[PDB]
Amino acid sequence: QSLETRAEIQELAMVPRMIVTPQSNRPVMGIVQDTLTAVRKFTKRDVFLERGEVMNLLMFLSTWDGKVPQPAILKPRPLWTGKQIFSLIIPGHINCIRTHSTHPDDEDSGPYKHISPGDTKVVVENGELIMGILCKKSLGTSAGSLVHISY
Amino acid sequence: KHMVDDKIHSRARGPIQILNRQPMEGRSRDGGLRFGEMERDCQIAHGAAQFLRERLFEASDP
Amino acid sequence: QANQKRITTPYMTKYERARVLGTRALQIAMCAPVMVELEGETDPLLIAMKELKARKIPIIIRRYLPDGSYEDWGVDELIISD
Amino acid sequence: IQRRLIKSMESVMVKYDATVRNSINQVVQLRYGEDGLAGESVEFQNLATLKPSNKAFEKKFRFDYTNERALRRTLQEDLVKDVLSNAHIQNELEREFERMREDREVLRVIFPTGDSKVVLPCNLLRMIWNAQKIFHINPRLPSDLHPIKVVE
Amino acid sequence: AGILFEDIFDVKDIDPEGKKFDRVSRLHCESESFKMDLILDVNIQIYPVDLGDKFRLVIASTLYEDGTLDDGEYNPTDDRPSRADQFEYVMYGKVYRIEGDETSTEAATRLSAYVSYGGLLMRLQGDANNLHGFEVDSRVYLLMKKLA
Amino acid sequence: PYANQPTVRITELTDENVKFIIENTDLAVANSIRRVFIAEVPIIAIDWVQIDANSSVLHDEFIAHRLGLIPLTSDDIVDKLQYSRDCTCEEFCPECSVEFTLDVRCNEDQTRHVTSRDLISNSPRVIPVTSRNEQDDILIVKLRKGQELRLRAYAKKGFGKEHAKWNPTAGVAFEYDPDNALRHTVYPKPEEWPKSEYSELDEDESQAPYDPNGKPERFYYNVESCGSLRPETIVLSALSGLKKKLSDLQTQLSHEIQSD
Amino acid sequence: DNKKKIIITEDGEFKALQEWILETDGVSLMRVLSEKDVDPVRTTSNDIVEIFTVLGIEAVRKALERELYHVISFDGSYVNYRHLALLCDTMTCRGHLMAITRHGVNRQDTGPLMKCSFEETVDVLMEAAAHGESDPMKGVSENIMLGQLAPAGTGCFDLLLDAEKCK
Amino acid sequence: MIIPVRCFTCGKIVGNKWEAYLGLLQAEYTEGDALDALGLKRYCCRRMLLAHVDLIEKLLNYAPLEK
Amino acid sequence: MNAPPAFESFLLFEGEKKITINKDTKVPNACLFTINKEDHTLGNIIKSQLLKDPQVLFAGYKVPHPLEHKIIIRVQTTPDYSPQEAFTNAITDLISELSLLEERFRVAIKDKQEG
Amino acid sequence: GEAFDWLLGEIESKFNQAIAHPGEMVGALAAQSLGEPATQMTLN
Ligand SMILES: [Zn+2]
Ligand SMILES: [Zn+2]
């Protein structure tokens, strides 16, 4: 009921200032039920979006520079990938390495460490999801996730 | 039975109790919501001293 | 206490920022002169944040030490992070 | 239990001399968390010199200024010549390694179990990665960074 | 020209580890002119590829036949002569890793360029002579055509 | 850059439903037509009730709600009547509304079924569908000896966006690509799924081979009418309403462009 | 490995020696430590009171930190160490084991108004009356009761108008 | 308490089918065959007729307030 | 208590414009059309018709909130073209398509009732 | 050299940002941090 208390709440208790908790030095809020099941399905390797679908999704990016990205597949038909659109969602130029929950433990030893057959081993570079399926481990409330590194 | 219209409630300078001049209790009494001990502790952790004083002094019983 | 040697942090704390912004916003709302230029801002909080970014808030923070002494810092003397 | 804990610690606060004190002004901690750092900014990291063996520690952290061709692969020509010729620089790097070895023993007595997971303010590997990508560092070409500049 | 690499590959295996994704398939191929291994992720739904097929692969830095950089932005209303006209399957990705057999003292005899086409991953590994055009964090095109 | 040239093929036309196929149109056009069938095809329905006497076991709002959902023949009258918003009259007039009266009293020992046949209108063209000259009459309320219901309703022009009682459809079946050739669905086990009535596949084949160059064409419709409008009148009124929405939008667009 | 014997080999690697350890159902730390072939350096107990009686206040500080950490982390959870450290310093900063109860929290010199907020409101205020105790209004509870700005967060400092800068 | 007018799902009129439904049931139809005779082909309208409890018949066992 | 009248989804409030055009500054030759008291019914068809124009580089729409009753359609065209002109042509093409569809449905009904 | 200088500045700024602020009610914060997880761990 005063400008002083309003400024206090706006500078101390606002939700974005509350993303990381001092209790366990990690995010306290993360991506949750539908958005998490769907981002897992969306960042799978075989998710291909058509031009109209991509424009529909870009309508819902607030932080979009208005430039349609070059599709990952140009021929025989232009197709964007879910990782290619989440790369637009990912802010700044953050860099992050995670592993999808189904990541086999004997894959980081053998070959294909940097080209994962299962599309596990999340790698975000310069704010582009170079590879990997996003999940709780990448967008949840754990330490070192994309939301934490973004904050 | 739990419909929202029987639960929604708001207050801005309504009636107060007789003994301690604080907001009444309940929707039916047009009462205010309790800013309890745990809310006090939360706002102490926040460090919001003026908001804490507003809730526990100025919005209750100056 | 010797103002030549102030031991407290040269940064403005989050609480100092909060209270300074609230105080200056109330002062602006009570028709105090504004220290910065204004395009179309009419909200006292926006004007106070513009003054803080410009380092033109005429407030001194008196930080008390546990021993009882105090240190006076101008809002322009502190490092504003957020 | 929650109420009891709160009423026991409610007035403990970080003061402007950076000590943590209670209402009586008694000192509970000379610095918050023994390090004077807030818990939101710290994060998990790894101490790289804790677990490795003496041979591995030597091989990974001792700057080898004798292998001319390896330096030629890592550094530019003027840096290679300065590193190989100058002895002041070589002594600086030698003392750098000695200081890291002393740090290794300090870590070994701090963490008597070989657990390199630590919680520290700045994620140095992530910052190094950020610098690599911001300045377009080519990992395959020799660098123009003088190791003496790194030490200083 | 703007071509970083060109060769003819022969599909020697498809999904050795089993089908991981429905519309995407991993091809393990080998060329003949350069003896380069290739792991490639392709959308087999729109561009099916059978075992034993033979195709020409062209990693390029640009699609315009004349040396001219790309802006990385989608411009379907572009009437310039694009080399994608001469190919069937075209993808657009970025190099995210370059490995090699280099030592602390010796340079690399064999390189291994890794590219990601919006998540569809490729590894082109072989002699370092054929992979000087590849630089990490650099955008390239696939330009792949099937031949009989 | 220009319009489609859709074609139409009506495969069934009864008094109860119309089953047709639109080819060579976009899926958005087909679904907007489907949505307008439900939500922007006006009809006449009771939207004002005045209970003068109700001794029945259902309270007043129950009877009013129940009267609102009785379909009224709206075929040629709905285009002529105005919205009460647009009428320059008082609360009501014959240009924007239709008056109904209901007056029933159970004096006899058997239960009296107050049905839609008891809704007497001033307009002969706008009457309850069941009362039109088989299907029985919609039951408004059952009355016991000594119970009585006397009310006065007014029916208005509206569409399904405002209330489902102004929805003329009793189901709009809409389908496309009956054989999953565009793969807009992905069956985990395509053999487990029954075949569409519009499918053209031999029984061994579960779904059509995937069409990479395909687009949704050939949309199948089954527009069932609640009774107020004929099904073909629902479709024609839907097309006209969508076209007038677009025309009004273009008029306002032209004013905004020229004002800049 | 948390109970194995972690040594440093001559090559400099951490090696976990798999050795016999005993777990007792009672505690005599005083006696068990002073037994032949018993390690008097790593042998410990979970009874913090005995640790305080045998080893002292800093030993019980460390042991109490260990036991609270064990309770918190047993379900895989994690809490920043500064919170455990602050709780453990609160219980040990006065040289004795200060329980988080009325018997430990209302027995320190915190002021009668802070104490009445927690427990034993009437007994505390009556004791303060009988002994003429004075509350200096240093804590947050006392200021909150009197409707004054708590010396907490935004209240831990004062603001002054800068006359020379209003120009 | 009384048969709804429309089907909640599609909006098909079911109010005029309760009495016919009961007459078919006393005519030794099965509930499924009765629902087929009335033209309720979607399982939503079959739900409407098949799950209806005519409570109004019990409310009409009480004398009204006025004679 | 808080239920908006059902007509507020269809009816314009006094002084509220049916459509508003705002230049998009992020990219050139782009506009935002904020259309009040419409929903997916017109948004989807206008978007899909705009996608048929090769001079349209972007065509999308969104209902920013289902409880609110407006849509926003973003249209970007090639520099020689205009988003307002594209939007106008899309509406004209939809109107012509619906007129043709209506006439052909009338013909089909006449054939079906006759034989 | 440019990358290393930027890295040094970044480390310095982030470290100074990690320093605890005078006025933080670390005691109430610690009580909450230790009591909130207590509500999930098992009674038996
Ligand atoms: Zn009228
Ligand atoms: Zn139904």
Curated annotation (Swiss-Prot), chain G:
It comes from the Eukaryota. It is found in: Nucleus; Cytoplasm; Chromosome. DNA template strand binds at residue 102. DNA nontemplate strand binds at residue 107. The tandem heptapeptide repeats in the C-terminal domain (CTD) can be highly phosphorylated. The phosphorylation activates Pol II. Phosphorylation occurs mainly at residues 'Ser-2' and 'Ser-5' of the heptapeptide repeat and is mediated, at least, by CDK7 and CDK9. POLR2A associated with DNA is specifically phosphorylated at 'Ser-5' of the CTD by CDK7, promoting transcription initiation by triggering dissociation from DNA. Phosphorylated at 'Ser-2', Ser-5' and 'Ser-7' of the CTD by CDK9 (P-TEFb complex), promoting transcription elongation. Among tandem heptapeptide repeats of the C-terminal domain (CTD) some do not match the Y-S-P-T-S-P-S consensus, the seventh serine residue 'Ser-7' being replaced by a lysine. 'Lys-7' in these non-consensus heptapeptide repeats can be alternatively acetylated, methylated and dimethylated. EP300 is one of the enzyme able to acetylate 'Lys-7'. Acetylation at 'Lys-7' of non-consensus heptapeptide repeats is associated with 'Ser-2' phosphorylation and active transcription. Regulates initiation or early elongation steps of transcription specially for inducible genes. The C-terminal domain (CTD) serves as a platform for assembly of factors that regulate transcription initiation, elongation, termination and mRNA processing. The trigger loop allows entry of NTPs into the active site, switching between an open and closed state with each NTP addition cycle. Catalytic core component of RNA polymerase II (Pol II), a DNA-dependent RNA polymerase which synthesizes mRNA precursors and many functional non-coding RNAs using the four ribonucleoside triphosphates as substrates. Pol II-mediated transcription cycle proceeds through transcription initiation, transcription elongation and transcription termination stages. Belongs to the RNA polymerase beta' chain family. Component of the RNA polymerase II (Pol II) core complex consisting of 12 subunits: a ten-subunit catalytic core composed of POLR2A/RPB1, POLR2B/RPB2, POLR2C/RPB3, POLR2I/RPB9, POLR2J/RPB11, POLR2E/RPABC1, POLR2F/RPABC2, POLR2H/RPABC3, POLR2K/RPABC4 and POLR2L/RPABC5 and a mobile stalk composed of two subunits POLR2D/RPB4 and POLR2G/RPB7, protruding from the core and functioning primarily in transcription initiation. Part of Pol II(G) complex, in which Pol II core associates with an additional subunit POLR2M; unlike conventional Pol II, Pol II(G) functions as a transcriptional repressor. This is DNA-directed RNA polymerase II subunit RPB1. It comes from Cricetulus griseus (Chinese hamster). The gene is POLR2A.
